[PDB]
Amino acid sequence: DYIPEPMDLSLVDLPESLIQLSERIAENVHEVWAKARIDEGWTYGEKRDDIHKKHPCLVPYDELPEEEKEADRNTAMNTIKMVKKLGFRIEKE
């Protein structure tokens, strides 16, 4: 049934000062996520396992494969781009 049709955001221009911060944003979004899982019993596991509550990404953000770091930064940049697209101004103070 399901064909996802995301919004085209490729022509949204964010401030360069903000894009240089992708890493920092992505890291904190990662740490929040980690705290939630740790506080529900999740621990590190070489392979992801829902029943024994393991997960290979329950590591410090810098210890993540850059694959996943890339994913995180792009999630954040797309999140912020939707915001500019919805009629909001983003400017450095």
Add this chain to the structure above:
Amino acid sequence: NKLDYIPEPMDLSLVDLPESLIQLSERIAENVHEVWAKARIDEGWTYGEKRDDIHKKHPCLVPYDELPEEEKEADRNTAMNTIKMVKKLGFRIEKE
């Protein structure tokens, strides 16, 4: 080996976003879902009632509006916590 991983996220509890932006968190989180979904489908993941990594079956591979509301809340929060961090790092966010 007993240095272990203590997450310590930034304290965003005092960051105030514009209300009209919070009112839109559903729309933002939906489009993040459309992107994650389109990504997974393009590498063969499909829907299944329970999650399985061997056949690439995931229960959230559904239209956003049909997600269980616990998942929707998660999404809205990631999105508002993402842009709170943008405010905290010293960027102004106003409606146009």
